[PDB]
Amino acid sequence: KGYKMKTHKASAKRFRVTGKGKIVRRRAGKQHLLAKKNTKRKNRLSKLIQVDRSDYDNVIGALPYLKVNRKV
Amino acid sequence: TRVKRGYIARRRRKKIRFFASSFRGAHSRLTRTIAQQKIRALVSAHRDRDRQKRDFRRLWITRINAAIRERGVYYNYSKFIHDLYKRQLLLNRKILAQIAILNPNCIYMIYNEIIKKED
Amino acid sequence: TRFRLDNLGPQPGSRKKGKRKGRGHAAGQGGSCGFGMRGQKSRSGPGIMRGFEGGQMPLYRRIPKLRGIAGGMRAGLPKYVPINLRDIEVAGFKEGEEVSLESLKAKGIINPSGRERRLPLKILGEGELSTKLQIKARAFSGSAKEKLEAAGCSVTVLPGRKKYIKESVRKNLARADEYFAKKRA
Amino acid sequence: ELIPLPILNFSGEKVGETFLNLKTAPSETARAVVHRGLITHLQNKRRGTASTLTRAEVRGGGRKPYPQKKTGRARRGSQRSPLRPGGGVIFGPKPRDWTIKMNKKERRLALSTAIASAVGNSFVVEEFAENFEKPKTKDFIAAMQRWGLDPAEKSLFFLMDLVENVEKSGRNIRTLKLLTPRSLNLFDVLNAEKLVFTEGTIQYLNQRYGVD
RNA sequence: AGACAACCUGGCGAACUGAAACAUCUUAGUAGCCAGAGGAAAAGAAAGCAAAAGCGAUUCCCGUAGUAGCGGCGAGCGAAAUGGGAGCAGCCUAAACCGUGAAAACGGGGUUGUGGGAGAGCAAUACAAGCGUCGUGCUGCUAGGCGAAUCAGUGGAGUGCGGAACCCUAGAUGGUGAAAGUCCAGUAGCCGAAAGCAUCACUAGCUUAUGCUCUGACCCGAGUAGCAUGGGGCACGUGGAAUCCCGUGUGAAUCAGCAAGGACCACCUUGCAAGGCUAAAUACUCCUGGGUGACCGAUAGCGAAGUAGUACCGUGAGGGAAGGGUGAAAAGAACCCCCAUCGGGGAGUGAAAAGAACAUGAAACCGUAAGCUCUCAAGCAGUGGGAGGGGGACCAGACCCUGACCGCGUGCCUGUUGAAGAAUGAGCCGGCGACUCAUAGGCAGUGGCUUGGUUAAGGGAACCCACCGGAGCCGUAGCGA
RNA sequence: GGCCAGUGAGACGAUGGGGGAUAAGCUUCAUCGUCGAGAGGGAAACAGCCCGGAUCACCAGCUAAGGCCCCUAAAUGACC
RNA sequence: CGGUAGGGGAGCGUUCCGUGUUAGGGAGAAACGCGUGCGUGAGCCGCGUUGGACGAAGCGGAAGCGAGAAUGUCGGCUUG
Ligand SMILES: [Mg+2]
Ligand SMILES: [Mg+2]
Ligand SMILES: [Mg+2]
Ligand SMILES: [Mg+2]
Ligand SMILES: [Mg+2]
Ligand SMILES: [Mg+2]
Ligand SMILES: [Mg+2]
Ligand SMILES: [Mg+2]
Ligand SMILES: [Mg+2]
Ligand SMILES: [Mg+2]
Ligand SMILES: [Mg+2]
Ligand SMILES: [Mg+2]
Ligand SMILES: [Mg+2]
Ligand SMILES: [Mg+2]
Ligand SMILES: [Mg+2]
Ligand SMILES: [Mg+2]
Ligand SMILES: [Mg+2]
Ligand SMILES: [Mg+2]
Ligand SMILES: [Mg+2]
Ligand SMILES: [Mg+2]
Ligand SMILES: [Mg+2]
Ligand SMILES: [Mg+2]
Ligand SMILES: [Mg+2]
Ligand SMILES: [Mg+2]
Ligand SMILES: [Mg+2]
Ligand SMILES: [Mg+2]
Ligand SMILES: [Mg+2]
Ligand SMILES: [Mg+2]
Ligand SMILES: [Mg+2]
Ligand SMILES: [Mg+2]
Ligand SMILES: [Mg+2]
Ligand SMILES: [Mg+2]
Ligand SMILES: [Mg+2]
Ligand SMILES: [Mg+2]
Ligand SMILES: [Mg+2]
Ligand SMILES: [Mg+2]
Ligand SMILES: [Mg+2]
Ligand SMILES: [Mg+2]
Ligand SMILES: [Mg+2]
Ligand SMILES: [Mg+2]
Ligand SMILES: [Mg+2]
Ligand SMILES: [Mg+2]
Ligand SMILES: [Mg+2]
Ligand SMILES: [Mg+2]
Ligand SMILES: [Mg+2]
Ligand SMILES: [Mg+2]
Ligand SMILES: [Mg+2]
Ligand SMILES: [Mg+2]
Ligand SMILES: [Mg+2]
Ligand SMILES: [Mg+2]
Ligand SMILES: [Mg+2]
Ligand SMILES: [Mg+2]
Ligand SMILES: [Mg+2]
Ligand SMILES: [Mg+2]
Ligand SMILES: [Mg+2]
Ligand SMILES: [Mg+2]
Ligand SMILES: [Mg+2]
Ligand SMILES: [Mg+2]
Ligand SMILES: [Mg+2]
Ligand SMILES: [Mg+2]
Ligand SMILES: [Mg+2]
Ligand SMILES: [Mg+2]
Ligand SMILES: [Mg+2]
Ligand SMILES: [Mg+2]
Ligand SMILES: [Mg+2]
Ligand SMILES: [Mg+2]
Ligand SMILES: [Mg+2]
Ligand SMILES: [Mg+2]
Ligand SMILES: [Mg+2]
Ligand SMILES: [Mg+2]
Ligand SMILES: [Mg+2]
Ligand SMILES: [Mg+2]
Ligand SMILES: [Mg+2]
Ligand SMILES: [Mg+2]
Ligand SMILES: [Mg+2]
Ligand SMILES: [Mg+2]
Ligand SMILES: [Mg+2]
Ligand SMILES: [Mg+2]
Ligand SMILES: [Mg+2]
Ligand SMILES: [Mg+2]
Ligand SMILES: [Mg+2]
Ligand SMILES: [Mg+2]
Ligand SMILES: [Mg+2]
Ligand SMILES: [Mg+2]
Ligand SMILES: [Mg+2]
Ligand SMILES: [Mg+2]
Ligand SMILES: [Mg+2]
Ligand SMILES: [Mg+2]
Ligand SMILES: [Mg+2]
Ligand SMILES: [Mg+2]
Ligand SMILES: [Mg+2]
Ligand SMILES: [Mg+2]
Ligand SMILES: [Mg+2]
Ligand SMILES: [Mg+2]
Ligand SMILES: [Mg+2]
Ligand SMILES: [Mg+2]
Ligand SMILES: [Mg+2]
Ligand SMILES: [Mg+2]
Ligand SMILES: [Mg+2]
Ligand SMILES: [Mg+2]
Ligand SMILES: [Mg+2]
Ligand SMILES: [Mg+2]
Ligand SMILES: [Mg+2]
Ligand SMILES: [Mg+2]
Ligand SMILES: [Mg+2]
Ligand SMILES: [Mg+2]
Ligand SMILES: [Mg+2]
Ligand SMILES: [Mg+2]
Ligand SMILES: [Mg+2]
Ligand SMILES: [Mg+2]
Ligand SMILES: [Mg+2]
Ligand SMILES: [Mg+2]
Ligand SMILES: [Mg+2]
Ligand SMILES: [Mg+2]
Ligand SMILES: [Mg+2]
Ligand SMILES: [Mg+2]
Ligand SMILES: [Mg+2]
Ligand SMILES: [Mg+2]
Ligand SMILES: [Mg+2]
Ligand SMILES: [Mg+2]
Ligand SMILES: [Mg+2]
Ligand SMILES: [Mg+2]
Ligand SMILES: [Mg+2]
Ligand SMILES: [Mg+2]
Ligand SMILES: [Mg+2]
Ligand SMILES: [Mg+2]
């Protein structure tokens, strides 16, 4: 009984991984106030986007058991 | 495994102290001061090994100017040197200074060659 | 060229000597140690949380939770051990041989762990099998059993464990079958 | 095999020849594999017994300036600390375990490479076990000197059996190690000047570690 | 009855802290305090898990797993079943009924769950198994004993050195004027207990015991379960909130029952609450006996190698130091001289005076002697040039010490847009004094296998370690809530 | 792309401007240089101006910016 | 081939362990003091009209492993 790293749970309900090993997320803002957002915008906010390279650190740091390829 | 520092320090200190022998006052005594004083010494040394190369050319030139000025009324260092070059002689300033002191007659001759040829 | 305790030594590069910070400048990271000047990151003690940016609403908090997870809809889980035909080709199977589950542990092309142990087997078509094999599994993909019955292999489909049903629902589901049967006949 | 082995009877004449053929580490990494194996061995042997007291173990704190001077431990107005004499020890040793791991196959490889380096020394023997009945040290040493072992240089007897008479008869020489396969270490092989096997032993070793 | 280090059980039960504030949450049911018992305690013999296939009291380790989940869905918290091991053990009682009484009690009977027992009849009987005064037994512990093998030379001393020998079931260890298998005490090996203790066997004795058939009417742990409310605890924060345990109030059913299977109802499966008791595997060190130490060596190691919980300080709770190493042996210096003692100088002891404030004895700091040199001088004290003077040389043209006079030269650190700063810090010297360890994640470098790789706990001639131990784990399929 | 840092108080100078009084060694931006983190020379001394970017030795030589009465290196040079 | 924050490479030393009950050592070890010795440096190698019993090199391993700053800290000793 040592200590093993804990997965940061609030980060894992947000991000996940695709089979080839890139991280993805939802897009923000499709929840309420949709009437005044045009359909085109709503479609754009419906899809799954690969997380910006920049944040990869923070994310990766808080989800140590996520299997991830950064493509090396 | 506990390790006392032992002599590793005192040797270093001692080998510094050897350096600082014959410094007046507490520069030859206390370790902490001695350190600094070592560094400064080493530093001046380095500096003045460069100054040295400047200062002897200072000197040499001065002595040469003195040595020549005796002959002509109108003769200089500047004139001299310019004349040494347009006559194609290689002698540098150390040699002309040491020959100015230690073999004066020689310099008189040299001057007589430069004069004869500029004539 | 004989080994003794004294001629031994490591491989170049193997054990690289570690930075000891805080010793000397000329060495390495002396004084500050490579923490630069001051403020939080140079201070001793636990840092700030990994996912946290300055008090701006952190990235993970400003993004909405993933689809099913978000409410407590159970996560999707593998229910079979998928095998292609590739693997069964590469393996040493001579004709007539039974494949099943067990004989795939035998040759090792599947190493099951706990969750996987408790599972059944399913076959996925990929690659083109040349042999006649006797295959046993709880399930097949369409392309699978198509390619299999095309190559002349016998496909034994194993029964799954009966779902217990109370009698009333048997009466309903049977009443159905009686309807179909009286209608076609 | 690229080299024979002498098989000697109890009197020291050469009866026969054998071959001991094993998995060797490929010639470049040999040294390092053995090395590693060794390091591992010694390092697991170690018992970290070194213990200190941290700043919180040390007897007799109270949190205050000291009221009066304890000669050598403090002065009148000072704060309690690690920086006194008789203060806690910052980053001292605590009892450890030093135990590291290594692959089984790697281990075995070190063993083989060592024993296969030892083929420039080693003899074989005709299994003397019976000739000793009452434990006799003097006798064992006699036998050694007939085989050409100086009871100086540290030699290793690897055999299958411990026959009590043999075992006790060798118990008191500091340079001998009588090994069963039960106890066989990389350490002792590396250490030993002369290697000595029985026939049954060669049959064992050449099987366990045999190259295919 | 009191005492008792840690461990343990029960009762009360915080706060700083984390959440970059804080209030739910965290810290943590931790510390502390009270009470209690043991060498372990507690838990424990399914009103249990599970899922349509099965298990078979409790505890502990590995793993599942940082998975399912919980959460101002924030900080964080965090299971279980399957699977592998360690270790194994199951028993007493209430009620129906039959005896004795007016009772309340006592004696027999009776204890189980894919139901048992009471009731009513007919068969079997001898072995088996469990407990245990008394006692020579076995072993061990608490005193012990026997125990192999060497000499001379070498400058205080020989165990060292050179040179000869020998023992070894003994070459562990400590001592000895100096390092020893062979000098001493010992070690291997082998013998030994009147008395007490302990584990084991046996030990009269004490215990128990089967088998079938009929009978739903008799029993199967009541102010209980449940229900309504108020909480607590379960990984699970009231949530759809099961299971578990408590305040207030109501309040069942007996096997044709009752409970559990994560609201609830049906169906099936599993189990039998409201009475008890029980060994081992596990935790710990005020200690006892052995062992080892990439542990300390007098500022270290325990606070304590000497009066150490002392001196001293505090009304009191409490705080809490320092002082080790003459020599092998005191052989601790007779006698004379200075002489009131101390102290000294000879002599004598000693390998050495090492001379008692005595072993190596650095620096600061205090001096003494010899070489050069300063009293018209301005300077972070040096440095490049070197007048004059002095010293030990062998490459005598060199080295070393001094320093007439010229030039150059704004202490160190920290920290700053920037410092000689009149910015901080250091009296000086010597010691002590800081990126450490454990466990995981990622990356790199090296190896090992790639007939994919690897074992965890666990076992090991004590450790290490051969050889096991495939449970797990990583890689072989993705997409999708 | 990977691994893994500091930095996130700047100063003046040239130039374009705003605020201010076309005040400030003021303040705030824009395009540059030096200092920061740069020693050497010129500037009496003199972070930010000019020259130039210091691997090291030499009792060698040529120059830049700048200078040639004496302190103090070089012309008490020439001609208007 | 200037260099602060800072990153990377190559090394030296200290105590201990392996080799090792090692080589060497009352024909004087550690240490202490010295050098016209060798290193880019940390340092090494040599020497002792000190000292009185231990202990290298090589090839490896481990850390209570290098001090001038902490109004650090304990002793010693100054200044006034
Ligand atoms: Mg995948
Ligand atoms: Mg919606
Ligand atoms: Mg980063
Ligand atoms: Mg030590
Ligand atoms: Mg230290
Ligand atoms: Mg001088
Ligand atoms: Mg490290
Ligand atoms: Mg480095
Ligand atoms: Mg510093
Ligand atoms: Mg850093
Ligand atoms: Mg700082
Ligand atoms: Mg910073
Ligand atoms: Mg902090
Ligand atoms: Mg945290
Ligand atoms: Mg939502
Ligand atoms: Mg999925
Ligand atoms: Mg797998
Ligand atoms: Mg304390
Ligand atoms: Mg201490
Ligand atoms: Mg009591
Ligand atoms: Mg009491
Ligand atoms: Mg007790
Ligand atoms: Mg709070
Ligand atoms: Mg608070
Ligand atoms: Mg903390
Ligand atoms: Mg807080
Ligand atoms: Mg805070
Ligand atoms: Mg026990
Ligand atoms: Mg109990
Ligand atoms: Mg049972
Ligand atoms: Mg029961
Ligand atoms: Mg289990
Ligand atoms: Mg078992
Ligand atoms: Mg059982
Ligand atoms: Mg009974
Ligand atoms: Mg049933
Ligand atoms: Mg029934
Ligand atoms: Mg009956
Ligand atoms: Mg005896
Ligand atoms: Mg004897
Ligand atoms: Mg002798
Ligand atoms: Mg001898
Ligand atoms: Mg003696
Ligand atoms: Mg001895
Ligand atoms: Mg004995
Ligand atoms: Mg019944
Ligand atoms: Mg109730
Ligand atoms: Mg309700
Ligand atoms: Mg209720
Ligand atoms: Mg609750
Ligand atoms: Mg609840
Ligand atoms: Mg229950
Ligand atoms: Mg359950
Ligand atoms: Mg219930
Ligand atoms: Mg309760
Ligand atoms: Mg009832
Ligand atoms: Mg049940
Ligand atoms: Mg019951
Ligand atoms: Mg209950
Ligand atoms: Mg019960
Ligand atoms: Mg109990
Ligand atoms: Mg002392
Ligand atoms: Mg002490
Ligand atoms: Mg001492
Ligand atoms: Mg006297
Ligand atoms: Mg008197
Ligand atoms: Mg006297
Ligand atoms: Mg005398
Ligand atoms: Mg004498
Ligand atoms: Mg002394
Ligand atoms: Mg005057
Ligand atoms: Mg004068
Ligand atoms: Mg003066
Ligand atoms: Mg001067
Ligand atoms: Mg000046
Ligand atoms: Mg000046
Ligand atoms: Mg300021
Ligand atoms: Mg100052
Ligand atoms: Mg400042
Ligand atoms: Mg300031
Ligand atoms: Mg200080
Ligand atoms: Mg001050
Ligand atoms: Mg340190
Ligand atoms: Mg850190
Ligand atoms: Mg670590
Ligand atoms: Mg790691
Ligand atoms: Mg590899
Ligand atoms: Mg193991
Ligand atoms: Mg064990
Ligand atoms: Mg073990
Ligand atoms: Mg900002
Ligand atoms: Mg700012
Ligand atoms: Mg700052
Ligand atoms: Mg400006
Ligand atoms: Mg401007
Ligand atoms: Mg304009
Ligand atoms: Mg104007
Ligand atoms: Mg303006
Ligand atoms: Mg300004
Ligand atoms: Mg310009
Ligand atoms: Mg700066
Ligand atoms: Mg620059
Ligand atoms: Mg400049
Ligand atoms: Mg200047
Ligand atoms: Mg420039
Ligand atoms: Mg250049
Ligand atoms: Mg010129
Ligand atoms: Mg001039
Ligand atoms: Mg003029
Ligand atoms: Mg350059
Ligand atoms: Mg550089
Ligand atoms: Mg740097
Ligand atoms: Mg060394
Ligand atoms: Mg050493
Ligand atoms: Mg020796
Ligand atoms: Mg010596
Ligand atoms: Mg030593
Ligand atoms: Mg040396
Ligand atoms: Mg060396
Ligand atoms: Mg001695
Ligand atoms: Mg060595
Ligand atoms: Mg040394
Ligand atoms: Mg330390
Ligand atoms: Mg100091
Ligand atoms: Mg002060
Ligand atoms: Mg002091």
Q: Indicate the domain borders of chain B.
A: 1-116
SS (H, E, C) C54-104: ECECCHHHCCCCCCCHHHCCCCCCCCCEEEEHHHHHHCCCCCCCECCCHHH
The verdict on a CB contact (< 8 Å) between C8 and D121 is: no
What is residue A17's three-state secondary structure? strand
User: Does residue A10 sit at the C interface (CB-CB below 8 Å)?
Assistant: yes
Residues in Cβ contact with D109 at an 8 Å cutoff, skipping those fewer than 6 apart: D23, D25, D33, D37
Task: Tokens for D15, please give them.
Answer: 């009866």
Instruction: Domain count for chain A, please give it.
Output: 1
Task: Tokens for B20, please give them.
Answer: 């600082």
Question: Chain C: residue nearest D113 by CA?
Answer: C3
Return the H-helix or E-strand segment holding B108. Answer: helix B104-118
Tell me the residue range of the domain where C150 lies.
76-160
Measured between alpha carbons, how far is D210 from D24 in angstroms, rounded to an integer? 10
Tell me the residue range of the domain where A72 lies.
3-72
What is residue D170's three-state secondary structure? helix
Which long-range contacts does C52-57 make (Cβ < 8 Å, 24+ apart)?
A: C53/A58
In chain B, the largest separation of any two C-alpha atoms, in whole Å, equals 90
The verdict on a CB contact (< 8 Å) between C4 and D29 is: no
What is residue D161's three-state secondary structure? coil
Method of determination is: cryo-EM
Task: Tokens for B1, please give them.
Answer: 């495994």
Instruction: Domain count for chain D, please give it.
Output: 1
Number of C–D residue contacts, CB under 8 Å: 34
Strand intervals (E) in chain C: 81-84, 121-124, 134-137, 139-140, 154-157
Measured between alpha carbons, how far is D25 from A22 in angstroms, rounded to an integer? 40
Measured between alpha carbons, how far is A25 from A49 in angstroms, rounded to an integer? 6
Measured between alpha carbons, how far is B98 from D147 in angstroms, rounded to an integer? 87
Return the H-helix or E-strand segment holding A49. Answer: strand A49-50
- Comparing CA positions, the residue from C4, C12, C16 lying closest to residue D28 is C12
D 128-157, residues with C-beta < 7 Å of strand E: 134-138, 141
- Strand order of the β-sheet with C81-84 is C81-84, C121-124, C139-140
Tell me the residue range of the domain where D52 lies.
1-212
Do residues D162 and D183 make contact, with C-beta atoms less than 8 angstroms apart? no
Resolution in Å, one decimal, please. Answer: 3.4
The verdict on a CB contact (< 8 Å) between C50 and A58 is: yes
Measured between alpha carbons, how far is A51 from A24 in angstroms, rounded to an integer? 5
Task: Tokens for C83, please give them.
Answer: 């095998």
- Comparing CA positions, the residue from D204, D212, D18, D184 lying closest to residue D114 is D184
Vertex D119: Cα angle to D113 and D123 (nearest 5): 135
Using the CA of D91, give the nucleotide whose C1' is nearest: E436
Task: Quote the minimal CA–CA distance from A39 to chain C in Å.
Answer: 20
CA of C172, C1' of E216: distance in angstroms? 35
